[PDB]
Amino acid sequence: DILLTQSPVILSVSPGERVSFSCRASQSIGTNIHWYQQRTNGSPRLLIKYASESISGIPSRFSGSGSGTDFTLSINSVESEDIADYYCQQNNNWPTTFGAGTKLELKRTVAAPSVFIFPPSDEQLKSGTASVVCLLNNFYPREAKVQWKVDNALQSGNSQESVTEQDSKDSTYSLSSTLTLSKADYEKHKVYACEVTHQGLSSPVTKSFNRGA
Amino acid sequence: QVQLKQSGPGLVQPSQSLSITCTVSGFSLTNYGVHWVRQSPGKGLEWLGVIWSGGNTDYNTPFTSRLSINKDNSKSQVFFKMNSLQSNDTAIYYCARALTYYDYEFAYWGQGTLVTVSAASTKGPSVFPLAPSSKSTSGGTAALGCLVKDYFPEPVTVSWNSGALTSGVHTFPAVLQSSGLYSLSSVVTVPSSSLGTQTYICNVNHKPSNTKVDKRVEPK
Amino acid sequence: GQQDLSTRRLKG
């Protein structure tokens, strides 16, 4: 089995810059290498075949070169639709094998999050559980803190975060913090507050609500 | 055009066997080989095998004993079957077709079938509204969503207004709760002035449990 | 570095 080593693991570039992906093989494989793109929730998409040959329907900004063991996938002027993982594949030797992939992240200007908070629905409360959701929308970069308070008591360990992959159009992220209480706990308190810290805010932003209204 | 359509995602219990059906169109199975590839956290992309135009099979070396590929040319179906699955066989399985009948450059892929190997049981989600309010309006924009809670296994599909609403949608990656069930939210931002006139429905489908829910989300 | 079956994207 030929080992294909892709480097680096993550590539971070700004829109319009050039970018190259390295695929090195554990022995000579000629030009028997293919490149694939994979976007969030997608199947792989064939970009180049045999090191350098074009594929119908693939933007001309994609090109590949190399022979023997050292191979390069190049995007001459990167766009945000290029946010994806990229894999090489060799087939000079059976069985065909793939590299482990390089991630392509995009830089952009700082974008502060828009913060929204959602109380638990009366539908959920009938089940005896309370989820409070804090939405941080369309921000950059990815680092953000969410701090939960219930009647000024700091909440710890009872929340979970999820972050979308980078947006293919505006290169931002969105994040959700879900705070989960029992119905009894929820009913026992009044002020529910989500405090958000991000590089794009000059001071933390707090969205809160009183149970009821 | 050329398409490959796979059967839905599902649970398989440890030691039991995985079956996936690839239904192709835009070409004839008598003219092209169909390959099977998977994507796992442990091994990454991994070519599994192929059934060729004439019915011959080749299996990647670690799978020769527990893999079997068959096809019905007339029905344009390829049947993938793998025996004695363990946890590290949890992966997304794909069928693929190459450019030419004999080659391995995969220009056409199925949508993938996420297979979870787990002793646990299938469980449909409950869907709760994330209702817009003043605490969720900012400068003419309101945010609203659906809380898709306590399901197993992945995946779940979420669209808005039956596909017609796509702008401003964020469906968050699922997170695994300490109960061993997944939870996610799907959000969308919309003009607040449309909350009176327009209807906002998240369409939830949990294919492993045959659970389809349409949740209307209204201001509270 | 590892693929994430939820998003089909590489995460660490």
Author numbering:
A (entry chain A): 1 to 213
B (entry chain B): 1 to 220
C (entry chain E): 1 to 12
Source paper text:
Multiple strategies have been developed to modify monoclonal antibodies, including chemical conjugation and protein engineering. Recently, we identified a cyclic, 12-amino-acid peptide that binds in a cavity formed by all four IgG domains of the cetuximab Fab. Owing to the location of the binding site within the Fab, we have termed the peptide a meditope (medi-, middle, + -tope, place). Based on our observations, the peptide–Fab interaction does not affect antigen binding. Herein, multiple crystal structures of meditope peptide derivatives incorporating natural and unnatural amino acids bound to the cetuximab Fab domain are presented.
Firstly, we focused on substitutions at position 3. To test whether other side chains could be substituted at position 3 to form additional bonds to the Fab and/or through the water network, we used PyMOL (Schrödinger) to identify side chains and different rotamers and to replace the phenyl­alanine with a glutamine and a histidine. Also, the modelled rotamers placed the glutamine side chain within a suitable distance from several proton donors/acceptors for the formation of hydrogen bonds. Given this, every substitution at position F3 significantly increased the off-rate (e.g. nearly tenfold) except for diphenylalanine.
